[PDB]
Design a protein around this ligand. Structure first.
Ligand code: HEM
Ligand code: HEM
Ligand code: HEM
Ligand code: HEM
Ligand code: HEM
Lengths: 306, 306, 306, 304, 306, 305
């Protein structure tokens, strides 16, 4: 088989997201680093096992792929598609490489990011760097549990990993990232019952609203999608709180993994453009997107044979 | 009889340092928050006990003290003293209020900082915000164990807490903060043996160099000071690594607590001005101070009384 | 096919709930069964990774006939009462079993509260037991309990239905019995006499040699080989329970097997005896007061209902 | 003098046992009392450091007179029944209290088994409750419970008898009530309405400001100031309990104080009300079915 | 007030006991090491906190004291006295220095022992080296819980630390060590009931036998001693199992601390010489002493000043 | 076929036992082998989940012929002595290996006591070592030890016998060597000089680039490719041991492989050298004083006795 990267990681309380662009003539340095990234992960992580749980998932953008490699391309790889809805806009921002670094402690993430960027100095320019921390009861910046309905085990593998539909790229995945800033003053102006009608789940107990109370423009109603054959279309999320108390910056760094970008893109279209039944996802009246990029995360053996 | 704030904290792997100035007319809002800060600490921290270990130490600058309170001044409270050495400078920067927030996780520090700054918006301006993380083996940004010779138990109480010498302020302490950025490039150019001659201890095993081979301009030699009676003068440190790999910012946020500022200021004078035997502390040839402030951290009952 | 969480990691707390379905309660019950996996996620996700909450849901032979209109699992029948010369294994009513396990009683109790909230008016409670395991895996008799359970691949082969009943693959069969002990009589035996009842050493949990182990010891009678001389295995998670006021000291027995015939062969040898043994000596200090049999279907069977 | 483990670390499991002493049981009881600290060590030591097992032993007003001759602790009396306009605090029988706490129910149950084994034939059980805390210190009403308890030095001064009753120094007074909740009615309230009953925000556990806090909120009525304007404090370790089958959802209340006067002033305000408040709004969703008062002596009193 | 060595330690699962003699002319090397040993403890231990729990207690024999120091002798310090009972003998064996090294892991003990013996090679001759391990439920080599009736908190300090009776040595303690080998074959030939009559406690539940059943020659009866007034004389023990399965060596390395040696030596006289009511301690019919030594463990400041 | 616990989680304590079978001891040994998995559960289950106790049982080449009739595992032979120009890999006697691992020394000790209790009078001890790993996975030379071990499916492929020897599938081959270090000489090197001996950075455990890594560094010599250009890998769990009184500072080496040919190729390059290197520089600070080879069968092979 092909061996996947660590897309299906165990639960982690800390994360670093790094997005860079490749400077002109930086290609060779980048290909050198990509062949060594799993070795750097083992070197930083092994001495802190079994509790460290350090991993790095490496992603490549559509334009970067054409600069790095000749030949066949993953079937779904394109630049993030901007959405200009009647009220809300999903922006596309630059990004050639993604490092999704996760662990039980921020210091491990930071040590592996230091070795990665040390190897890339002179070849890349930083676009975004976020240090994520999860709240102790899995809560996000809106005060709701975040992760509950992710798929697990076999269902997760089927949802996230490329298989026989794109055989040359089997064991790969597609990652969409969006950094959101929240308007917390507006959000805290709602009662708890009004907040629940935005999300579609109870705040304190995390039980889903009944089919008879759940609004058509609630976040959970719009991100719930069935395919033609009536199967659930699922993604795997590992969204993380971040920000700065001084600048009054309260955010959610969103990442979703899927076997095809079509599933993630159908969810984003319903959220930003709406449906017959809903103008837009009510979560967006308290959340502004400031970045948007799409990456292909290849099989581990693809990176190792560079 | 008077109950100290949590100056003598158990070991914590995360910290937030917040330094603010009080805007004109902000005094009353500030006094109201100071009387509630212990209540806010319990509200965020109690539900995560016993492993959260959340604490907040609140400090007040010399000029802020005169705007907030009439009556007696703590005996040792003055503005941080700038040090103009022939090569190295210890700069003085503005700060009226210090919040030293510590816990076993960054998310708890961040939740308490959010409640504090929520009460003060409109009354203060942020000067510095740092999110610190400790390495898994108590290492700092230079790769040395950091904290080894701090005093513990009764020796720590004697070294840090004001007593009979200033009876109205007993159970208080004095906090000096400096943010340092390191030249990691220059530091990693040294052999391990050359790094040991800068610090004064072995890197991997943290054994002190013997009295005959320890250089006179090593960090350990210069911060070792005896009083007139031949007593060792000690401080309590809780320095934290911080940074951003994208902006190449690798730092140490220094905080030191002492029963009198004269002990910390004797250490800073030896480091920046030198002695007959040493021009300056060699650690300063790889470390630049960008902030400097001095605060009195009163007994908890002093803050509760307002 | 995705099993329910039959093969769970070690748990120190459990709630057993046995209920009968009132006339006309069927539709409410079918609605709850389609939601029970989502209720497990709602209560459990925010307490991960340490909570380790799971629920295994079972259906009795007569309830199956009232709920579902197609094929029956091949081994599902009402518990068979065993009328021995001395000891009786009684059959008591039960339509639905909830086997709820976690690292803490409060999590089991929160999931039981949500389940029973959905069933109020549709079911009548028959049994509710709150179990606790001793810190060194000991039971109410003071012996280590679980030692010879199968693990890994052997456990899956022993417990999960496969090719022999393909429509119900990934299911299992659960036998429950509540036992009350005569602890006064038990504690009147010497430790050596207790060892001859169980078949293992009390302090060190070493199996008695084939030369000393009596024919009517618990371990001799629950050791059974199939036609090829292969060991027939069950998976147990028996839990102590009781009340010191009422002098109630119990063991709540649950055993899981791929076919009821394995557990029923073990009960026949215990209660009816063999050529070599009148009955299991453990029964001279243990009285069964309940007995029921349940089919625990594959998770996808419960999810795909109406 | 060495106190019993009144000031315990946080515990997630508890057994409450209340018994009466049968006639002629006195000597069996006095034998167990001299050995109960030994039994605590016997069951607990092998499960350190995580077990955190302790047992606090209390004696009622009537029982004291049957067991001991000489001076009585100054504040020891039978629980006082409160007959309010709407809500009633009942007085129920109890001679001995065992407050058993640990990180796991199985350790509580092991110590309870050895204690009741020693007392079989001398005592009648009145109450047995097995308590569990929710993983974020929440109680049966879904609020954080314990937040304003005193800690360290403040806790010692609030809870332990000192120079005012020198023969009984290092003792405390324990008040217990078992409450059953109407959870149906409680879950019918909005979160905002629940906050106005308790006097704290539900999700973040921040006290309501003095301008929005209702006068008949639980926190407003259990706030009492002394002559010098000091806070009068108690130490609580109230525990959820119940049965899902029988629809029984409860809080087993225990409060410790250096004098019963502090706890009894709080109960009078809750049940009788004041000029400003009819009664504590928490009592429109909580019914007391037991009430008892115990003196918890110093460890050395029990030993000698 | 004087700072004790870490005599009152938290529970530790591993230990190294080192006993050495000072070679002729080794005195100055030894005095140099003694002034550094607390700094070596911090150097090895700090980076492994909070779980390491590493400490070292340093003791000095009666004859060594006279070679190392001029001035006052601690009032209770004398050579261990041999006990020649009718059946059992307590031997006295040489030792000038004791290192009692404890931690949560053997590797920490070993790293500190390596640094100590590195400083002394050429100055000392090793007499005994023992690597101790406690069983997971505090059980010893005889299978009984060991430590239960040790004093804690304030009672422990009163029992172990020298006070105003010998003011120059306040915060010191007296350590007696004996290495015992067990006859395991003979011991395991006893029933649990017979083992309980030797120890004086129930094996599984660690409940003390009643005054009416506890034999007069049981270990617990003979090591229970009351002073001239009425009160219990206590010592603090941290005895550890040790052995070699190859050599058939199964041992208990006994260490007891007391404020005066008279308490420990009264316990030894009752065990070896017996009373009116008992010939000897029944534990001695399964345990042979092969070493016996007495040390004074001074206050930490005594060692630091020299 | 259910393997023994070769692929164990990380363990901080170990006991290694090597014994020879006395005349007439065969029957006692066969009895103990059929019971050893049940003794592991008896000592370990009560201490789960933190105990992580396991025992791996191995049998030497000569012992196999005394214990069992029928087929021999294809790769089982006596350890081959290497007499290199400077350094020697010695062979020492061994019929049975017990590789006992846990999170605490006391659990290893309890299981070794029950095993040796069953064998008293049937076996003679050759070697007994009590191992301890440093808290940050460091070894006796002060380097992280384990970093490049294979994990998951790559580990199973590297260690477990498959279709090449079908009657012995789920078995493995263990090579043991006890090493004593000259720590005085080692600690006389600068950190930079030590890195050039190992082939990795000491503090950060980053591999030296192919351009700086010397040809006689330990990592260069124990890196081996097959005909197919694929890496040949082993699974190691080498453990520090010593006695501070005796000045004994050691590494007890154990390596597991699907075939002995992989471990034997690594030992030949270390002790005999290559075109580019006289010998492994790690051997100028490490002396081998034991050497033995064992087959560790599938668990069901031992049970069906
Ligand atoms: C870049 C900033 C700094 C770094 C990375 C740093 C790092 C260290 C390190 C590695 C040690 C040795 C281990 C220990 O005992 O903790 C140490 C010791 C110490 N440092 Fe610093 N230090 C810094 C700044 C300061 C400053 C500004 C002061 C005083 C104002 C200071 C006072 C001390 C003292 C008192 C010790 C203990 C000396 C002894 O062994 O007795 N440090 N520092
Ligand atoms: C009072 C109720 C029971 C108690 C207290 C109890 C206790 C025990 C104990 C202490 C063991 C030995 C350790 C171990 O788990 O391996 C054991 C083993 C066993 N018990 Fe029971 N048991 C009970 C009832 C039952 C019942 C009703 C069954 C089956 C229908 C059962 C089946 C087994 C089996 C299969 C084993 C393992 C046998 C082997 O070594 O292969 N037990 N039980
Ligand atoms: C159904 C029974 C009870 C429930 C569920 C309950 C629940 C709570 C809650 C959630 C708090 C707020 C957070 C905290 O400080 O813990 C609280 C505070 C408190 N309760 Fe209660 N309580 C009950 C009965 C009682 C009784 C009977 C008393 C006194 C006799 C009492 C005295 C207090 C005190 C003193 C406070 C703290 C007030 C302050 O902030 O100073 N409670 N209780
Ligand atoms: C191989 C040697 C020894 C073994 C295996 C051993 C074992 C134990 C055990 C199992 C207990 C009961 C549980 C407890 O409270 O710790 C105990 C108690 C005790 N042991 Fe020993 N012991 C040994 C030698 C000694 C020596 C040589 C002395 C005194 C010089 C001693 C003094 C004590 C004392 C003072 C107690 C506490 C008794 C009480 O007050 O209840 N032991 N020992
Ligand atoms: C004498 C004591 C020994 C010590 C102290 C030692 C130490 C080390 C250390 C520190 C590493 C680096 C980290 C790692 O990947 O584990 C390593 C790697 C390794 N050692 Fe050794 N080793 C020893 C003997 C041996 C022996 C006898 C063999 C083989 C027969 C061997 C084969 C290996 C292999 C295969 C690797 C991984 C190579 C790679 O990176 O691909 N070692 N050893």
């Amino acid at each position: 088989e092909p061996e996947p990267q660590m897309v299906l990681s165990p639960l982690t309380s800390a994360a670093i997201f790094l997005v860079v662009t490749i400077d002109s003539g930086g290609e060779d340095t980048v290909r050198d680093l990509l062949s060594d990234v799993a070795s750097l992960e083992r070197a930083v992580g092994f001495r802190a096992q079994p509790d460290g749980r350090l991993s790095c998932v490496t992603g490549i953008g559509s334009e970067a792929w054409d600069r790095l490699f000749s030949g066949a391309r993953p079937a779904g790889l394109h630049p993030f598609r901007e959405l200009d809805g009647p009220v809300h806009r999903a922006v596309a921002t630059p990004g050639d490489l993604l490092f999704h670094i996760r662990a039980s402690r921020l210091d491990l993430c930071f040590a592996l990011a230091t070795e990665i960027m040390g190897r890339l100095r002179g070849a890349v320019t930083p676009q975004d760097e976020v240090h994520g921390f999860k709240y102790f009861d899995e809560r996000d910046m809106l005060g709701f549990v975040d992760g509950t309905e992710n798929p697990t085990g076999a269902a997760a593998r089927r949802a996230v990993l490329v298989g026989a539909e794109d055989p040359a790229f089997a064991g790969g995945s597609y990652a969409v990232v969006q950094k959101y800033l929240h308007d917390i003053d507006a959000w805290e102006g709602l009662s708890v019952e009004a907040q629940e009608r935005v999300i579609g789940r109870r705040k304190m107990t995390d039980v889903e609203l009944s089919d008879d109370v759940k609004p058509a423009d609630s976040h959970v109603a719009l991100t719930s999608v069935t395919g033609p054959d009536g199967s659930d279309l699922e993604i795997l999320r590992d969204a993380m709180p971040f920000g700065s108390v001084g600048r009054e910056e309260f955010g959610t760094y969103f990442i979703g993994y899927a076997r095809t970008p079509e599933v993630t893109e159908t969810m984003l279209e319903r959220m930003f453009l709406g449906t017959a039944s809903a103008p837009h996802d009510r979560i967006l009246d308290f959340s502004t997107a400031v970045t948007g990029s799409l990456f292909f995360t290849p099989a581990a053996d693809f990176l190792e044979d560079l």
